[PDB]
Design an enzyme around this catalytic site. Structure first.
Site, short mmCIF file in Angstrom:
data_model
loop_
_atom_site.label_atom_id
_atom_site.label_comp_id
_atom_site.label_asym_id
_atom_site.label_seq_id
_atom_site.Cartn_x
_atom_site.Cartn_y
_atom_site.Cartn_z
N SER A 66 0.78 -1.24 0.00
CA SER A 66 0.00 0.00 0.00
C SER A 66 0.81 1.29 0.00
O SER A 66 0.19 2.35 -0.13
CB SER A 66 -0.97 0.03 1.16
OG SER A 66 -1.92 -1.00 1.00
N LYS A 69 -0.38 3.16 -2.85
CA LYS A 69 -1.53 4.06 -2.88
C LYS A 69 -1.11 5.51 -2.92
O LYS A 69 -1.82 6.35 -3.49
CB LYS A 69 -2.42 3.82 -1.66
CG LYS A 69 -2.99 2.41 -1.56
CD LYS A 69 -4.10 2.32 -0.52
CE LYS A 69 -4.91 1.04 -0.66
NZ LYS A 69 -4.04 -0.16 -0.57
N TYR A 151 -10.96 2.03 4.70
CA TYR A 151 -9.76 1.88 3.89
C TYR A 151 -10.05 0.90 2.75
O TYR A 151 -10.62 -0.17 2.98
CB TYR A 151 -8.66 1.36 4.80
CG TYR A 151 -7.29 1.26 4.19
CD1 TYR A 151 -6.48 2.38 4.06
CD2 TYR A 151 -6.78 0.04 3.80
CE1 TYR A 151 -5.21 2.28 3.52
CE2 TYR A 151 -5.52 -0.07 3.25
CZ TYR A 151 -4.74 1.06 3.11
OH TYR A 151 -3.47 0.98 2.58
N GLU A 272 -1.47 9.75 5.38
CA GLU A 272 -2.14 9.94 6.66
C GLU A 272 -1.18 10.69 7.57
O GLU A 272 0.04 10.47 7.51
CB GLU A 272 -2.47 8.57 7.28
CG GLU A 272 -3.34 7.72 6.37
CD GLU A 272 -3.32 6.24 6.73
OE1 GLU A 272 -2.74 5.87 7.78
OE2 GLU A 272 -3.88 5.44 5.95
N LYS A 313 2.76 6.23 5.98
CA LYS A 313 1.95 5.22 5.30
C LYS A 313 2.59 3.85 5.51
O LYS A 313 3.80 3.69 5.34
CB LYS A 313 1.83 5.51 3.80
CG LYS A 313 0.86 4.57 3.08
CD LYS A 313 -0.60 4.86 3.41
CE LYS A 313 -1.54 3.79 2.88
NZ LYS A 313 -1.48 2.54 3.70
N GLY A 315 2.61 -0.29 4.29
CA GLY A 315 2.30 -1.12 3.15
C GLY A 315 2.74 -2.55 3.36
O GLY A 315 3.80 -2.79 3.96
N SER A 316 1.95 -3.50 2.88
CA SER A 316 2.30 -4.91 3.04
C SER A 316 1.82 -5.69 1.83
O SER A 316 0.90 -5.28 1.13
CB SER A 316 1.67 -5.53 4.29
OG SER A 316 1.81 -4.70 5.43
P1 LIG Z 1 -1.88 -2.19 2.00
O1 LIG Z 1 -0.49 -2.75 2.02
O2 LIG Z 1 -2.47 -1.69 3.29
O3 LIG Z 1 -2.87 -3.21 1.31
C1 LIG Z 1 -2.52 -3.83 0.08
C2 LIG Z 1 -2.21 -5.29 0.25
O4 LIG Z 1 -3.43 -6.02 0.58
C3 LIG Z 1 -3.45 -7.25 -0.10
N1 LIG Z 1 -4.54 -7.21 -1.10
C4 LIG Z 1 -5.28 -6.12 -1.40
N2 LIG Z 1 -6.20 -6.41 -2.36
C5 LIG Z 1 -6.05 -7.71 -2.68
C6 LIG Z 1 -6.69 -8.66 -3.62
N3 LIG Z 1 -7.70 -8.26 -4.42
N4 LIG Z 1 -6.23 -9.93 -3.64
C7 LIG Z 1 -5.22 -10.34 -2.85
N5 LIG Z 1 -4.59 -9.53 -1.97
C8 LIG Z 1 -4.95 -8.23 -1.85
C9 LIG Z 1 -2.09 -7.44 -0.76
O5 LIG Z 1 -1.22 -8.08 0.17
C10 LIG Z 1 -1.67 -5.99 -0.99
O6 LIG Z 1 -0.28 -5.81 -1.17
#
Ligand SMILES: *P(=O)(O)OC[C@H]1O[C@@H](n2cnc3c(N)ncnc32)[C@H](O)[C@@H]1O
Length: 362
Positions: A66, A69, A151, A272, A313, A315-316
């Site tokens: 993230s 983003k 979020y 944020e 921010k 991210g993961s």
């Molecule tokens: P941020 O790092 O807060 O969120 C992004 C991570 O969330 C997981 N993620 C989001 N959306 C998906 C979908 N559609 N499928 C699988 N994983 C998802 C990932 O780990 C992103 O990097």
């Protein structure tokens, strides 16, 4: 190690926190980048890959999830300052297929601030634009857009999609051909090229399996960036106006505009922030808002980009854990990249301890 040198003191502070962090969490590799007093320090630890073994180096690419983003927001801000986008207009104004839907009442600002009400995750069965548009036409939020913060990867996807379309290009072209090159981030990618695959760290999931993120629809906007700690430190410096990059600087700074209050945080355009000096308890609370709905309260007129704030921010991905924080008033910032997804409270606590060490108390 040298006396009367801040650099050696900073390395000691960072080493003393990162080595136990990596040991107890079994994180194979990290890079930590710090800027203060106009100077940049990069510290690399451990392994980008276990088998065959490869060390973290200055060139190692990590998934940042993230953190991506904030690039979608920077692109939307660039479109806005370029006269191509108004944040107050509705989503359906820019996406005509959605006219007549609930997106008549969701603004671009709403998707840029997690206040549309779209859920966190894209439905797994959505594979193409046809299915995406059918879902978006049928969607209705549980609350009126602008009342709550949820979020959302989906909302971020729309933000970046709209921004790119307003610039006449795909999101991938907007990021890799316009935004990252103009920021001087030459080792940052949505798609890692063949000559950089040797530098792309493997992530290690909960079962310690080596994994790379699977890119799905609107995923580039929400979670697609792979980058080095050095490129992200440049991004942090650019966000503090420290580099001779004017529209791009305006775009970066404008992402820090405060649009909603929710809990302990001020929600900017994806970034944020919290008032500085900030307490660790409030920073921890403000970084525990990823999966639950909260009340959002508008800031109108918006809060201008500030110096006296902690901007951050997380991210993961399944295999990686990242964090950025910076305080413009102190021209200090930190990037922490890891190839294991370890808990956010630890990322934030380590960053707080490091930045707090960087000047005396007054
Ligand atoms: P941020 O790092 O807060 O969120 C992004 C991570 O969330 C997981 N993620 C989001 N959306 C998906 C979908 N559609 N499928 C699988 N994983 C998802 C990932 O780990 C992103 O990097």
């Amino acid at each position: 190690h040298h006396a009367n040198i801040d650099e050696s003191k900073i390395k000691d502070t960072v080493d003393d926190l990162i080595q136990p962090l990596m040991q107890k969490n079994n994180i194979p590799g990290m890079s930590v980048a710090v800027t203060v007093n106009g100077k940049n320090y990069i510290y690399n630890y451990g392994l980008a890959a276990k088998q065959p073994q490869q060390p973290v180096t200055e060139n190692t690419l990590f998934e940042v999830g993230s953190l991506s983003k904030t690039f979608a927001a920077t692109l939307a801000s660039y479109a806005q300052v370029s006269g191509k986008l108004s944040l107050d207009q509705s989503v359906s104004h820019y996406v005509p297929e959605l006219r007549g839907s609930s997106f008549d009442h969701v603004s671009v600002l709403n998707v840029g601030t997690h206040t549309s009400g779209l859920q966190l995750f894209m439905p797994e069965d959505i594979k193409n634009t046809t299915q995406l548009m059918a879902y978006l036409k049928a969607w209705k939020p549980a609350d009126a857009a602008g009342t709550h913060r949820v979020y959302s990867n989906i909302g971020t996807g729309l933000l970046g999609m709209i921004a790119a379309k307003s610039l006449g290009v795909s999101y991938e072209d907007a990021i890799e051909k316009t935004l990252l090159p103009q920021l001087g981030m030459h080792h940052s990618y949505l798609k890692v090229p063949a000559d950089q695959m040797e530098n792309y760290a493997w992530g290690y999931n909960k079962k310690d399996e080596p994994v790379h993120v699977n890119m799905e629809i609107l995923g580039n906007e929400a979670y697609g960036i792979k980058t080095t700690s050095s490129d992200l430190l440049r991004y942090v410096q650019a966000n503090m106006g420290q580099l001779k990059l004017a529209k791009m600087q305006q775009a970066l700074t404008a992402t820090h505009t405060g649009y909603f209050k929710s809990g302990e945080i001020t929600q900017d355009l994806m970034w944020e922030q919290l008032p500085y000096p900030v307490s660790l308890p409030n920073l921890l609370t403000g970084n525990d808002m990823a999966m639950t709905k909260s009340v959002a309260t508008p800031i109108v007129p918006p809060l201008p980009p500030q110096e006296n704030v902690w901007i951050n921010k997380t991210g993961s991905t399944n295999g990686f854990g990242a964090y950025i924080a910076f305080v413009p008033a102190k021209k200090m910032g930190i990037v922490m990249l890891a190839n294991k997804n370890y808990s956010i409270d630890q990322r934030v606590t380590v960053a707080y301890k490091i930045l707090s060490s960087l000047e005396g108390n007054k």
